[PDB]
Recover the amino acids of this structure.
């Protein structure tokens, strides 16, 4: 199979097809069944090394996006058993590093950040245009990691019935390489400054939104190069109640954070060739409930 | 042609094209001149051989289009030349159809 | 003529090429190409000589000549499969050889044949 | 638990896997009227007309024809009940000959056929296969129209003695001339139209 080790690889909503992307310059795809699997494809195209892809929601169907070093994002849609290259964007000065789909409640818009110091957000009508939402000086240096708003999370919606549809304000988070993290809300047609966060005196590497189903509060696991893992939490941003807590003091450059598809636990890639499996215990504290030696 | 030597003219042309030599842009004019012979009531016309002529013509025009655009000049007469080429091949088809008709009416 | 042509043997005359020439007379490229292609079909079903191979080559040749005339909004043909035809008029009935299964009208047992497919076929021929 | 959600889920499942029967069934069952409309128009109409499986989409269009469904879908009137009309006329004319015919439905045949001739024009095909099914429809309607115009003078109960009536092509032509026609059977149709215009012009204005 792949000529270079895998950064990212994602199964579907249905567990029956797997996309696997390396910096090995191409991305290969298996059908998944019975425990067996046939490599159905190996999509080429990416004239920069590949890191990340992005699947979309099932009520839309089957949609993938990908970033590369060549400042190209390639956009793949599956037909008749054939995934193929549907939209592709470039115009970027530095390698496009972060791509992530928005909740289908907000729609078919991908977020696209790069260490350019600035970030675009691209909408696909699904048949039509690719609406561009480009924000310059988003960083004074560059963008490392970005996360959306997950669309629905407790805190004020208990009194809001299931029959109606609530207002969908757009917000999100990210952290860059100017030693800072930042928080954004969308209005006036554009995005403005929820929050500035300066606690990691070094560059932040990865960011983790706790899928706050059951949580009125807003919960962040921020991992930087400086070995400090901050759980940032605010019950209310309007009363400005974001506070840092230590999750773990790893002595390695702290790398990756990703919540479960089951939205229960967090996987943290450490400078140990390991992925620590942490769960916020039922009581009050964050316990590394398991590990995977990479 | 100039002394209207239809039989041996056509035989030579058949032999030459079966020899399969020279660039396409000129086989254009080749069959352009072959036109009135094809028009004339002649029984030696082997329509099937005429049609490897035309299928090679298709092959060559496809290759010509792939290798270059027939008209890189935008003028009132470039589209004239093009549509003239399609009309030419349409004339090829229609004249061959007539020749087949005459051949059959003579096979009686 | 089709009543006669189906009823009589093909080796006496190609009434199919006869009708094809009529098609040419009447400027009907669709029907002409279909006739010549189906006569190639009949030859392929019936005979297996290399002369016959040249013959189906000519058949498919002429059909795609009609293709040279066909308008893009019609780039396809129908072809239904059916049973055999009577042979030896003036002789006893039930004279049937080889043959093909009959189709089903309340469905689509017919085959629609377009540019690229038929040129695949002629290239292989 | 309301089967609305289960039909939603198995419907998107089917839209993933490609089981035509199942997407159609569960789209009907959950009544996504507009999108089910649009998808059936895209695919299912041609499928059923060319494969002659009128039963299923017959029930389909029948339940869709309910006026409230017409209210929640744009352009139901444009196509769906139109093809429902096609198929209904086809079946009833078939059965009227499956028994001994009665003019009390033959007159309705004439009235609705010559009318819907006026709206065959407004058929809009945005696909090659859509226009192909349109062509198949046109050729079949020409065939059945020839058959019925021949048989409306039944072989033992002739309607008119020997009269050659004036053809309603004076109304048919301005609308039938608005669509193209394949020269395969356009030949015979156009020839019949030739002798029609001959008498029409020898007896013109």
């Amino acid at each position: 199979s792949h000529e270079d080790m895998i950064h990212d690889a994602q199964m579907d909503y249905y567990g029956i097809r797997l996309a696997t992307c390396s910096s090995d310059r191409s991305v290969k795809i298996f059908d998944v069944k019975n425990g067996g699997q046939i490599l159905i494809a190996d999509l080429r195209g990416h004239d920069g090394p590949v890191w990340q892809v992005a699947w979309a929601h099932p009520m839309y169907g089957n949609i993938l996006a990908s970033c590369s070093y060549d400042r190209k994002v390639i956009i793949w849609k599956e037909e008749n058993g054939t995934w193929e290259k549907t939209y592709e964007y470039t115009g970027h000065d530095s390698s496009v590093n972060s791509v992530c789909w928005a909740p289908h409640d907000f729609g078919l818009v991908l977020a696209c950040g790069s260490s350019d110091g600035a970030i675009s957000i691209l909408t696909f009508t699904g048949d039509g245009p690719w609406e561009v939402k480009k924000i310059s000086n988003a960083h004074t240096i560059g963008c490392n990691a970005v996360s959306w708003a997950p669309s629905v999370i407790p805190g004020s919606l208990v009194d809001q019935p299931s029959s109606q549809k609530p207002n969908y304000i757009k917000r999100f988070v990210s952290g860059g390489c100017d030693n800072l993290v930042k928080i954004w809300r969308e209005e006036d047609g554009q995005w403005k400054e929820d929050q500035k966060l300066e606690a990691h005196s070094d560059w932040v590497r990865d960011v983790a939104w706790a899928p706050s189903i059951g949580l009125p509060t807003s919960t962040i696991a921020s991992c930087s190069q400086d070995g400090r893992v901050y759980i940032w939490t605010s019950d209310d941003a309007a009363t400005n109640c974001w506070t840092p807590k230590l999750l773990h003091k790893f002595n390695d450059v702290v790398w990756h954070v990703s919540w479960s598809i089951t939205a229960n636990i967090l996987a943290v890639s450490g400078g140990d060739n390991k992925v620590t499996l942490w769960k916020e215990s039922v009581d009050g504290q964050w316990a590394c409930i398991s590990d995977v030696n990479k | 042609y100039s002394q209207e030597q239809f039989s041996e003219a056509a035989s030579l042309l058949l032999s030459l094209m079966t020899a399969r030599i020279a660039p396409c842009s000129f086989w254009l004019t080749l069959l352009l001149d072959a036109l009135p012979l094809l028009e004339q009531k002649q029984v030696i016309f082997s329509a099937e051989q005429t049609y490897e002529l035309m299928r090679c013509l298709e092959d060559r025009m496809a290759a010509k289009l792939e290798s270059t655009s027939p008209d890189e000049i935008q003028k009132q007469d470039s589209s004239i030349d093009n549509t003239k080429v399609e009309m030419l091949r349409l004339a090829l088809a229609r004249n061959l159809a007539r020749a087949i008709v005459t051949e059959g009416a003579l096979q009686e | 003529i089709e009543s006669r042509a189906r009823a009589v043997d093909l080796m006496t005359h190609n009434y199919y090429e006869l009708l094809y020439a009529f098609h040419i007379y009447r400027h009907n490229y669709r029907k002409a190409g279909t006739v010549m292609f189906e006569y190639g079909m009949r030859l392929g079903r019936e005979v297996r000589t290399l002369r016959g191979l040249q013959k189906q080559v000519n058949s498919y040749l002429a059909c795609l000549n009609c293709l040279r005339l066909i308008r893009p909004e019609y780039a396809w043909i129908v072809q239904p499969v059916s049973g055999a035809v009577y042979e030896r008029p003036g002789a006893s009935p039930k004279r049937n050889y080889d043959g093909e299964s009959s189709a089903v009208p309340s469905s689509s047992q017919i085959e629609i044949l377009e540019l690229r497919d038929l040129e695949k076929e002629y290239v292989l021929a | 638990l309301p089967a609305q959600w289960i039909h939603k889920a198995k419907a998107v499942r089917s839209r993933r896997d490609g089981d035509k029967h199942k997407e159609a069934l569960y789209l009907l069952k959950s009544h996504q009227w507009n999108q089910c409309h649009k998808l059936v128009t895209r695919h299912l109409a041609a499928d059923a007309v060319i494969n002659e499986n009128y039963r299923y989409l017959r029930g389909f269009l029948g339940e869709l024809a309910r006026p409230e469904h017409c209210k929640h879908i744009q352009d139901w009137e444009t196509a769906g009940k139109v093809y429902l009309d096609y198929i209904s006329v086809i079946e009833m004319l078939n059965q009227i000959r499956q028994d001994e015919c009665s003019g009390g439905e033959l007159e309705k045949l004439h009235t609705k056929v010559m009318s819907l001739c006026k709206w065959v024009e407004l058929i809009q095909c945005y696909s090659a296969k859509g226009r192909l099914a349109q062509s198949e429809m046109a050729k079949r309607v020409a065939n059945i129209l020839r058959v019925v115009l021949s048989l409306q003078q039944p072989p033992e109960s002739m309607s008119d003695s020997s009269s050659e009536p004036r053809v309603p092509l004076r109304l048919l032509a301005p609308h039938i001339g608005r669509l193209p026609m394949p020269e395969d059977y356009a030949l015979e149709e156009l020839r019949g139209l030739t002798q029609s215009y001959l008498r029409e012009l020898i007896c013109g204005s």
In short: The first helix of chain C runs from residue 2 to 7. Chain C touches chain D at residues 26, 28-31, 71, 73-74, 76, 105-108 (CB under 8 Å). Helices of chain C lie at 2-7, 15-25, 29-46, 50-69, 115-124. The two ends of chain C are 29 Å apart (CA to CA).
